């Protein structure tokens, strides 16, 4: 009965697995594949599964990751427009939908990307009832909130791609300035991934040397020896890459593998990422925006309480108020 | 009370972890720690566990690894003489017991290591009765059979480390001869890990090209011009080495992680390991010896039925009979 | 008073970085960037330089990677129209110029890319004079040979990505039928990258045991397992995959990179990349083609002399004369 | 006739690799091997040299490592008692010596050991003059300094393992206290490696947030998080581990390999490693202790200019005195 029949001889009995650490990537767009080439690269899934709506573009992104199986450690790769392939996934990376046209704000994609999520979020929990979701599609913090509601999952099992990517954009500009590696530069961007984001100068530092101390001019526009512009650089930066190439992904893709490695390796390491911050720094409502969370195998199991300077909570309320003004009309 | 008390403001229930891929290492001797360190750097455990009777050193070793944790991806490293730490392990590596003295036959350790596996194996299955048991302690094939019989686990969940090593030495000795990577030469040693092993020359190949075809008097009573004395190299290799350094452990440490990697990441790759070979190559008893096997997330699930020449099946039957002879009296 | 002056007290006096592991990628398109990202996650380069005609897009991808830098182990990432950004490159990948149309042969792209290659390559070897060219652009064999003649480079130093990728498909396909990882299947496809690929069935083994002796009508017309349907699917591959998604890239971004591993790490393993085959199996002319060779830090230092069948050899003859028939016409 | 002749056909006529990231690890005891095994598993080296006066043992640790090759990416392992085998080396780790008996403090050692370095250090520079030298043997600053002189290498090429391990014990002990990864726990134990180290409590942060600027008791007599107790452990550590298992190797070994990664990858990350301190916080003696410092392919190339309080710099100076006192009378 072929070769498998009288070449392989079962010591067991056939046999099914049950995925252990499966991961669905939802969307096989420029972002969807970056995340996917990077999950596969760090060897993070025993099974990787693709769901997109474009059936043809899927079978071929599926097929393409398939051919390289021999360089990779992910026995099962799979793909369908039916969400039945995502069954029993441990982490689900949503990326699907429309992206910013050159100039367009992330926040002008809500109406549209919400309608996407209105369909795809609840088919994910049908198939993987006990998953962690990662939300990457834009209005990311607004949709992390939309995902939270529709999924009907705990808060520690719904995670915003957040300002993990912002904070690395930041630690990378700091790193150029200093001529070291960003692993060795520390410092944080919290709140809305994008325009309304907050630089926390209090905590910018290198080998413990607070630089809000080593120049308290730091962050104060006009004055200062340069720091204002670094934050603007981070903020503007999404737009500045879109002008030149069309979109971003190699950095988002790696951010996400980061997030997933921390979690599937149960490391409890710290990540600035979008969560529900009701009841912190004076916040009226159920607003999702990023803060230094502890990612382990549970999902995000804590936030970190920081002494912020007065101005930085001011900036963070302006953010959470913006986001809450779109979420209060949302109703689904 | 401690800063955790409100440096960390949880989003998930204090709650109840449970390790995914936990791994236990019964024994913290030279071999034992070799396995622990190789395991640790490939990052295969999200919990390591070290058992032993030497209660102090044991705690020496744990604390020493712990100190390294910054450089690993292993959140929990515990250790006690009490098989109550090993609870929930996906894999238990048993290096426990006595080893060779300068000269000593692996087969001569059987009475003593039997008597250990006797009062240790029920303790392993108590706290973890769905764990793949890797037997390393010698003689390894017989204690694989002894582990099977005491443990009540199925054939595919007791795996002797077997010829994964002999065969790596052989591929390396091969490679030496030719100027390439071990990985790029191929060639199996099956049989008793030790004196009576079998160089399946039929299969020795590079780029698919069969070297016995290229050298028909290979592995042959005198005539060849290099071969038999490599198999003689592969046999005496432990004895050559224990003599200069007291013991072996890095090689075998590293094999036991090659098997561990392929099982946890579910890769379904072929290793010659020690599995029950009744019925094969006309074998009438439940001997455990080494043959090409597929190891996946379930353990040892397949044996590759082979086309051994009339004197490979011969020398194979001869390792069989020799192990069964030492096995037949055990009677526990 | 530059923030560096204040924070970093130099010890070795000012930078002058000894480049070392430069890798250039020519052409930041789909393939270009699959190679790039795949190189980055294996930390093979400590400098990456991209080149391309498309000034905007090029700056975008450099930027995009840069931003990921925190997630990486590549200190420097640069990019520019000029070949001067590629100086000292230990290994350079040319992936630029046109590609298939839905249905178009790889050789139908020749004249176009030769004219690219004509003003790309001289430039490459002005600036990285001691380097290893890895030619992805298609047709990959004939372009490897055109690279060879123009660059002047020792022939070992011009490696075509060849049939590394096909055998990697052919090993995945055979892996599905058998239910093991591709790594544990073994089976070469040699020759031209396109439709003359030969699948050397002599070699096709698993754990030593030839799948031909198992089945001696392998890869002929009527046979039980229908082995030609695998080799045909391996030829069809690119066509099917493009038809669904406009290109292939990932699986090739992986192989380019798997080969680079073998070089920079100096492993001497055997890949079926493309190499000048004059001398071999009757071939009288300077033909590039894919035979199992050894890669190390010198590049392609040795071919494995295989013991191929009569029919199998004809086929190389087939392949080597379609290639040579294009090749001779080229205005040099 | 040689099978390498029937099988291998040389494309580049004449094999012979140029030396490259040859690393050497001096002495093959507990620390020797443990550094080695961690260097090998991080795929950092294409030539491992082992050196040691006990030939016999040394040819075993050479061999036990050679057998493991298949599982590695380090194509030449070699060992000999003549430092010839360490020619054209790039990094050389010095672990040879004698070590503390239970109770012994690290200065009991200088005499016997300084006869040790007096032998070897030249023989490094004799055979491998263009190198970085990592120093681990005790007493380790007093021998670092001893190495700077003997070798007569530039400041930036002689580094001691120094406080790296301590700040790793530190960051790990901190980790237990908050339940995150020592890699999200930031903190610096600087100065002399043994009893005299110095916890810079200002740096000690987590996620941007200063700890001292939260609980100002830190470091004094009776603090209520008990933090002088932590530094306490980071100091006692060595001793208390030596009481259980006679020595340490693993922690040290991984951390040496971390330096070796930083530097081969030319990564310019910071590491609390030992280096010449005069001109820093008022040293007048030619003496080495561990400060935050930048580790690329040039070696240690700069330090971090930090603001350090009285009772620390004091701590530093008495350290740097005791240091010189031994030193001054060193019949070089
Ligand atoms: N949060 C972040 O840090 C971050 C960063 C970069 C990009 N993004 C966002 O991620 C998204 C993806 O980026 P991209 O460049 O891959 O976009 P893309 O156009 O390249 O990909 C679109 C993908 O989503 C699918 N899609 C479109 N409409 C859909 C629908 N109704 N239902 C299901 N799938 C649909 C497409 O088939 C395709 O798979 C964008 O919205 C982008 O803004 C977020
Ligand atoms: N399969 C292989 O390729 C291979 C290779 C090398 C060594 N080995 C085996 O390793 C075993 C030990 O080798 P080693 O050099 O580590 O010796 P070792 O002396 O260094 O280690 C023995 C350890 O076992 C512990 N121990 C003894 N009885 C125990 C028990 N009943 N329960 C729990 N722990 C117990 C001891 O504390 C000691 O720490 C030997 O059987 C030897 O054959 C196997
Ligand atoms: N060997 C293989 O396994 C394999 C597989 C897939 C594709 N390919 C080949 O790879 C090549 C690239 O494929 P692709 O999918 O990236 O197409 P692509 O459209 O994505 O790549 C085009 C790139 O070529 C660049 N380019 C054109 N002229 C240039 C010049 N004169 N100097 C520098 N850069 C120039 C463009 O500016 C652009 O960046 C094609 O030739 C394709 O056929 C080979
Ligand atoms: N800096 C750190 O963080 C750190 C940590 C642990 C150990 N150490 C030091 O490392 C050293 C040994 O550690 P160990 O546990 O491996 O000791 P070990 O006994 O296990 O290793 C000693 C090795 O040094 C060799 N040696 C002795 N005299 C020699 C000589 N004259 N020439 C060449 N080699 C010689 C021996 O042959 C042996 O190979 C001690 O100095 C110890 O304090 C430093
Ligand atoms: O973060 C980005 O770069 C981004 N790109 O598209 N949307 C975004 O948010
Ligand atoms: O083969 C070995 O390495 C060995 N050494 O001691 N026991 C063994 O199995
Ligand atoms: O085979 C492929 O992947 C391919 N697609 O376009 N050129 C190629 O070589
Ligand atoms: O720090 C240590 O662990 C140490 N142990 O022995 N010597 C040392 O330096």
Short mmCIF file of C-alpha atoms in Angstrom, two decimals, chain A residues 188-332:
data_model
loop_
_atom_site.label_atom_id
_atom_site.label_comp_id
_atom_site.label_asym_id
_atom_site.label_seq_id
_atom_site.Cartn_x
_atom_site.Cartn_y
_atom_site.Cartn_z
CA UNK A 188 9.40 53.90 26.46
CA UNK A 189 6.62 55.05 24.14
CA UNK A 190 3.10 54.41 25.59
CA UNK A 191 -0.50 55.31 24.63
CA UNK A 192 -1.93 55.35 21.09
CA UNK A 193 0.50 53.65 18.80
CA UNK A 194 1.00 56.71 16.53
CA UNK A 195 0.16 60.44 16.74
CA UNK A 196 -0.96 60.72 20.39
CA UNK A 197 1.91 58.68 21.80
CA UNK A 198 3.85 59.66 24.81
CA UNK A 199 7.56 59.58 25.29
CA UNK A 200 8.44 58.69 28.88
CA UNK A 201 11.65 60.66 29.47
CA UNK A 202 11.58 60.00 33.22
CA UNK A 203 12.71 56.45 32.22
CA UNK A 204 14.88 56.89 29.13
CA UNK A 205 18.37 55.61 30.29
CA UNK A 206 21.66 53.71 29.75
CA UNK A 207 23.26 51.50 32.40
CA UNK A 208 20.88 53.04 34.92
CA UNK A 209 21.92 56.62 34.04
CA UNK A 210 18.62 58.44 33.83
CA UNK A 211 18.93 61.01 31.06
CA UNK A 212 16.00 63.09 32.39
CA UNK A 213 18.52 63.77 35.07
CA UNK A 214 21.59 64.16 32.88
CA UNK A 215 19.74 66.90 31.04
CA UNK A 216 16.35 68.00 32.40
CA UNK A 217 16.06 70.16 29.26
CA UNK A 218 15.24 66.70 27.73
CA UNK A 219 11.85 66.61 26.02
CA UNK A 220 11.14 70.33 26.49
CA UNK A 221 10.58 71.75 22.96
CA UNK A 222 12.72 74.65 21.75
CA UNK A 223 15.41 74.04 24.38
CA UNK A 224 17.22 70.73 24.74
CA UNK A 225 20.02 69.37 22.75
CA UNK A 226 17.79 67.46 20.25
CA UNK A 227 15.39 65.12 22.21
CA UNK A 228 12.06 66.56 21.11
CA UNK A 229 12.67 65.44 17.54
CA UNK A 230 13.36 61.82 18.41
CA UNK A 231 9.75 61.37 19.55
CA UNK A 232 8.45 63.22 16.52
CA UNK A 233 10.64 60.90 14.44
CA UNK A 234 9.05 57.81 16.00
CA UNK A 235 5.59 59.34 15.57
CA UNK A 236 5.92 60.55 11.99
CA UNK A 237 7.87 57.41 11.05
CA UNK A 238 5.00 55.18 9.94
CA UNK A 239 4.04 57.93 7.42
CA UNK A 240 7.63 58.43 6.30
CA UNK A 241 8.07 54.77 5.28
CA UNK A 242 4.72 54.75 3.50
CA UNK A 243 5.77 57.62 1.26
CA UNK A 244 8.80 55.63 0.12
CA UNK A 245 7.63 52.00 -0.06
CA UNK A 246 3.80 51.66 0.39
CA UNK A 247 3.49 50.13 3.89
CA UNK A 248 5.40 48.82 6.96
CA UNK A 249 5.99 45.20 8.03
CA UNK A 250 9.54 43.90 8.77
CA UNK A 251 9.51 45.72 12.04
CA UNK A 252 5.92 44.97 12.94
CA UNK A 253 6.54 41.36 11.97
CA UNK A 254 9.53 41.04 14.28
CA UNK A 255 7.78 42.93 17.12
CA UNK A 256 5.07 40.28 16.97
CA UNK A 257 7.41 37.32 16.99
CA UNK A 258 8.98 38.99 20.04
CA UNK A 259 5.63 39.07 21.75
CA UNK A 260 4.88 35.45 20.92
CA UNK A 261 8.32 34.22 21.98
CA UNK A 262 8.01 35.86 25.38
CA UNK A 263 4.51 34.17 25.74
CA UNK A 264 4.96 30.66 24.31
CA UNK A 265 8.22 30.51 26.31
CA UNK A 266 6.40 31.76 29.40
CA UNK A 267 9.27 34.21 30.15
CA UNK A 268 7.30 36.96 31.91
CA UNK A 269 9.39 39.67 30.21
CA UNK A 270 8.28 43.29 29.74
CA UNK A 271 6.65 44.75 26.63
CA UNK A 272 4.93 48.10 26.09
CA UNK A 273 1.55 46.90 24.68
CA UNK A 274 -2.15 47.91 24.30
CA UNK A 275 -4.38 46.91 27.21
CA UNK A 276 -7.54 48.17 29.03
CA UNK A 277 -6.45 51.00 31.29
CA UNK A 278 -9.74 51.86 33.02
CA UNK A 279 -8.94 52.94 36.59
CA UNK A 280 -5.34 53.99 36.00
CA UNK A 281 -3.92 57.51 35.86
CA UNK A 282 -7.44 58.99 36.24
CA UNK A 283 -8.92 57.31 33.20
CA UNK A 284 -12.73 57.54 32.84
CA UNK A 285 -13.42 54.44 30.68
CA UNK A 286 -12.62 51.10 28.99
CA UNK A 287 -9.86 52.42 26.80
CA UNK A 288 -7.16 50.31 25.34
CA UNK A 289 -3.72 51.85 25.14
CA UNK A 290 -0.21 50.54 25.68
CA UNK A 291 1.69 50.19 29.00
CA UNK A 292 4.63 48.05 30.13
CA UNK A 293 2.98 44.65 30.52
CA UNK A 294 4.42 41.29 31.60
CA UNK A 295 4.02 38.72 28.78
CA UNK A 296 4.00 35.04 29.71
CA UNK A 297 2.04 31.91 28.66
CA UNK A 298 -1.16 33.23 30.24
CA UNK A 299 -1.08 36.33 27.95
CA UNK A 300 -0.55 39.75 29.48
CA UNK A 301 -0.88 38.94 33.27
CA UNK A 302 0.07 42.38 34.67
CA UNK A 303 0.62 46.02 33.77
CA UNK A 304 3.33 48.09 35.52
CA UNK A 305 2.45 51.07 37.73
CA UNK A 306 4.78 53.94 37.00
CA UNK A 307 5.34 57.23 38.75
CA UNK A 308 4.69 59.40 35.66
CA UNK A 309 5.51 63.16 35.61
CA UNK A 310 2.38 65.37 35.56
CA UNK A 311 2.70 66.21 31.93
CA UNK A 312 2.89 62.52 30.84
CA UNK A 313 -0.49 61.63 32.31
CA UNK A 314 -1.84 64.82 30.71
CA UNK A 315 -0.58 63.42 27.35
CA UNK A 316 -1.99 60.01 28.16
CA UNK A 317 -5.46 61.32 29.02
CA UNK A 318 -5.58 63.33 25.75
CA UNK A 319 -4.91 59.96 24.11
CA UNK A 320 -7.40 57.80 26.02
CA UNK A 321 -10.00 60.57 25.57
CA UNK A 322 -9.47 60.58 21.79
CA UNK A 323 -9.86 56.80 21.65
CA UNK A 324 -12.86 56.86 23.98
CA UNK A 325 -14.61 59.37 21.79
CA UNK A 326 -14.62 56.83 18.90
CA UNK A 327 -15.53 53.87 21.17
CA UNK A 328 -18.57 55.57 22.76
CA UNK A 329 -20.25 55.91 19.31
CA UNK A 330 -19.18 52.41 18.35
CA UNK A 331 -22.08 50.31 19.59
CA UNK A 332 -22.40 46.83 18.07
#
